[PDB]
Symmetry: D2
């Protein structure tokens, strides 16, 4: 579940919440990509949210180098399973991650069938 391509002080964590039910979004698949040298998206890490709606251990401090990363949340499969025909195919969060500043990231996403918000971070990890 909440795991991926690494284990460290958790430089990248994802938390998904369900705005219709008032609970975390469990079993939401997440795919992380890194912008490759040839400008394409290279697959970086993936997992699914736990019963807490969280995704941990996706990567590691060493592996998480500067770059443009795309965090893709499969919202569609999530609503489908619930009996709902959602509007979005998925929710994507694209950002630059460096060395030069903030180096631990909490990407949060609040889900509604026709809407979603996404917000980012704190500082060290907690």
């Amino acid at each position: 579940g909440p795991t991926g391509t690494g284990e460290s002080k958790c430089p990248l964590m994802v938390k998904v919440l369900d705005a219709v039910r008032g609970s975390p979004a469990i079993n939401v698949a997440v795919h992380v990509f890194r912008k490759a040298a040839d400008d394409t998206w290279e697959p970086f890490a993936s997992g699914k949210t736990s019963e807490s709606g969280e995704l941990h251990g996706l990567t590691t401090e060493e592996e998480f180098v500067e770059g443009i990363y795309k965090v893709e949340i499969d919202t569609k499969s999530y609503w489908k399973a619930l009996g709902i025909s959602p509007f979005h195919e998925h929710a994507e969060v694209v950002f630059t991650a460096n060395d030069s500043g903030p180096r631990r990231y909490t990407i949060a996403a609040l889900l509604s069938p026709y809407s979603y918000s996404t917000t980012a971070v704190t500082n060290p990890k907690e």
Copy 2:
């Protein structure tokens, strides 16, 4: 149609959206209040949103004086009518109307059974 009290160049407008169905929240009750000297809420204007999810002609420029206002939105009757169990009793937006600031105010509300956003203002008009 769906109007409040006074009709003319709208200094205050309300718009409500349904994030579950992806459409405007139609026929929603909104009640506006002004804090009186003894700090109690005196009814100011009221109305129900139209088929477009908007409420206009609530008040007028001469009537809308500086002060503290409360826009209360009956969110619960809305979800009940749809058969979804909601969390909130209602949504509220409390703000100070200040002359040296913008004249026109659009209070936007995006609704979910367990969550809501509220955003405000602009200046010239539509």
Copy 3:
């Protein structure tokens, strides 16, 4: 800080996030009221968010009986201190809390100077 009128399995917790800075909202004063028998708001508990943007220990399982509670977040003082003139006087969350179902509550609030969202819960506590 994150404390109030009780200590238990945390039936009521509050977390505030800053959407402009990407961090938790620290030192945000929170006031909780309970609808009184005579239909007025009786003060119930209060505190301020910690460095994590969270508020714990506000109440206790025994003290937190069925009722309509109003959670008031002093967003205005928060932005003022930051050098910003916000739009809202505060952010309020009004809901019924029972015995008959969900009995642990996490009220979260994401803050912007002219906007704010609020969402509620999970189930047991975590």
Copy 4:
């Protein structure tokens, strides 16, 4: 003024709001894409939001066929222009345009340096 490609009864419209200043996001670049057979994104329509934060006449009913669309919003250049350091590279909305569904689509985006919401649809018109 601020238009995309084809002009007439708008099957797709975009509106962007600034949650920091409480006004429309003016002069924002939006690029629309259609997934092609080989699953690559082919440019479909583009434009900059007007003084009202809207983008109209992007396409036309005859042109807007069923398929998967991507609306990319240049959020970063927006915050840079204001001098605020943002988190996201840009905002994206990926969705399937399906005939048996509504015809008109308004993609609404509410922006903050570290957070964004996106909501959709209605049906008849304005």
